[PDB]
Every structure is written in C-alpha cells, then in structure tokens.
Design a protein around this ligand. Structure first.
Ligand SMILES: Nc1ncnc2c1ncn2[C@@H]1O[C@H](COP(=O)(O)OP(=O)(O)O)[C@@H](O)[C@H]1O
Length: 327
C-alpha cells in the first residue's frame, strides 16, 4: 500500500504536470506572438500610449497544470502622475480592499484631451470595461492576424479579447489581453469584480509578488512549495465542486503555511499538503483568507457565504474520498 507521499508524486506525474514538450511549445508560441505584436504596435498604433505587451500567468511561470492552454498578454497603459490618481477600495463607498478607483484629475485644469485615455473615462474615473472595449476595437481596426499567423506558421483567430492560437495542427492556446495600469507603487488590472455594481473598480495586481515570493522561498532552500501548490491547483481544477477556488487563493494558503513552517524538504510534501488542506478548510470556516502580502485583502470576498460553505463541505467530504480527490 502506497504512502501519501507516493500517491501525491504519482498524481503530480500523471495529472498535474503538463507534458514537457507541450509546455515549452505552447509557451514559445505565446512568446512568438508577443514579439511580433511588439513590432506591430509601434508601427500601427503610435496613437495609443502603451508599453510593450508582455506575457503573464501560470503558463509563463511553469505553474500551469493539467494542460497548457492559456496565458495573458498584459497591456500596460502609460499614465502620467499629474492627470491620474488611484483610490484604494477602503476609501471608496464600495469599501472593498483589493480594488481601486482610477480618478481623472481636475478636469477644469486638465481638460479632456490631455490624455488619449480620456476617451475611456466615465464620471471622472478610468473605466476598466471601456479601456478593454476601446483597446479591442483599435487593435481589430489595424491588426492582420492572418498574416501574423502566416508569418509564424500559426493559425490565429480572435474568439473578443481572446485569441485562439493553433500552433501545432492539433494543439491550441488561448491568449487574452489584460489591460493594466501602474500608478505609483500600485499595479492594477482590468479584471472585473464579480458583481456588476462594482464594475467601476480596477483589481489590485497580486500575482507577480505572490509568485515571486514563492520562487524565492523555494530557491533559497530547494523546497516543495511550488510542487504542493501545483497539486492543489490540479485537484481544484479537476473537481467541479471546487471550481470556485483560484490559484491566487491556493498560493496564499501556501504562503501563510510557509510563514509557520520552515522545513519544506521533499520528504515533508505529504505533511505540508495535509496542512494546506486543513488550512484551506479553516480559512473557509472563518470565511476570510487574507492575502499574505496585503493582509487587509480578503481573497474570499467575491464568494457568497453559501458558496464558501459548500466549498468547506466538499473538502471535508473529500477527506473520506482520497481517490476521487486524486482522480
Ligand atoms: N500580472 C497580473 N496581475 C494580476 N492578475 C493577473 C496577472 N496576470 C494574470 N492575472 C490573472 O490571474 C488569473 C490566472 O492566474 P494563474 O496564476 O494563471 O492561475 P491558473 O493557473 O489557474 O490560470 C487570471 O484570471 C488572470 O487574468
């Protein structure tokens, strides 16, 4: 009979880990499109204030699990300090940490037209929706995907902000464009809040710091923090009743545990996995999962009380059903 340690490594091998060739070729296809858009953007849209779009997401980080089929292209707006301010959610009437307003400064003094992005402002705030609608239309209006693909031998076709890239004749990858804004030390992305009434808010960007801290910890001591995370990701992705859980939530569960446990030797994987599980359950029971980097942010905040309850129950039930959890 197998130890839990072995069952987890077996599971990772057979289910979580992407075939290494697929992982590299998928990622390289995304890298290829990125560079070609780098040239296009300069040549075609000098009008629009942006920097070079860059890749982001698990696929780029060797953190994607089960299958290599998605990655983000960050579309980084250039905003000048004088014209824009970001308001933290705790200071808005919405009162939601982890989300910001992007306020256009004093239009009596800086009239509409002082920035290209004035055309995406609503009621004095830069709109995440509108920025994304606007960018979509302006790229569509000048981009020739058929010749880009022709160039790279990829077949590329938009779905709206999502490209389906057919790199090998039988393989695909989805690239979606994620508008971003950096004001001072704050990085935001146009990833909408779940609820419509919060649709004026930009989302605080957490992933890069989180995943960097995860790498730093693992690199320093050669630990299994990333391996444990990927297993957790594959389980949640593979289990329908767990669909609500996110990679960011799981990563922060790991980060909290790492603050209390120094030994993440390969031999402790089983023990840490169990702590992670019992940790996740407990956060759900309290209905609060603080961000390890921004403890004011509750990562369960977009989950209803009943959804959190069913997540907790599903996980408690799975303790008796290890073979369904590791299918
Ligand atoms: N630089 C970034 N800042 C904030 N959010 C991001 C960034 N890059 C990707 N995301 C968001 O994170 C989510 C994907 O996270 P990821 O770590 O790739 O999890 P998964 O492997 O489950 O896709 C997406 O919803 C995406 O929009």
């Amino acid at each position: 009979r197998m130890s839990l340690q072995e069952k987890l490594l077996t599971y990772y091998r057979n289910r979580a880990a992407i075939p290494a060739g697929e992982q590299a070729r998928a990622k390289q296809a995304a890298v290829d499109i990125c560079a070609e858009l780098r040239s296009f953007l300069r040549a075609k849209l000098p009008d629009m204030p942006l920097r070079d779009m860059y890749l982001s997401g698990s696929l780029y980080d060797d953190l994607q699990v089960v299958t290599a089929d998605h990655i983000q292209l960050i579309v980084p707006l250039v905003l000048e300090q004088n014209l824009w301010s970001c308001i933290p959610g705790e200071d808005t009437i919405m009162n939601v940490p982890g989300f910001f307003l992007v306020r256009r400064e004093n239009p009596e003094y800086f009239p509409r037209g002082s920035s290209y992005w004035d055309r995406c402002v609503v009621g004095g705030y830069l709109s995440p929706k509108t920025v994304a609608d606007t960018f979509e239309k302006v790229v569509a209006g000048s981009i020739n995907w058929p010749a880009i693909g022709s160039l790279l031998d990829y077949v590329i076709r938009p779905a709206a902000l999502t490209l389906e890239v057919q790199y090998e004749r039988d393989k695909h990858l989805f690239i979606d464009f994620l508008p971003s804004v950096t004001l001072g030390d704050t990085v935001l992305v146009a990833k909408p809040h779940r609820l419509a009434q919060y649709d004026n808010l930009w989302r605080l960007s957490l992933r890069p710091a989180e995943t960097a801290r995860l790498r730093a910890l693992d690199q320093a001591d050669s630990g299994c923090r990333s391996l444990c995370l990927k297993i957790l990701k594959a389980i949640c992705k593979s289990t329908p009743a767990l669909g609500h859980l996110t990679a960011s939530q799981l990563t922060n569960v790991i980060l909290h545990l790492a603050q209390e446990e120094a030994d993440w030797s390969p031999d402790m994987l089983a023990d840490r996995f169990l702590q992670a599980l019992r940790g996740l359950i407990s956060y759900l029971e309290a209905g609060v999962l603080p961000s390890a980097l921004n403890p004011k942010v509750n990562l369960f905040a977009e989950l209803t009380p009943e959804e959190i309850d069913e997540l907790g129950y599903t996980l408690y039930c799975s303790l008796s059903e290890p073979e369904v959890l590791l299918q």
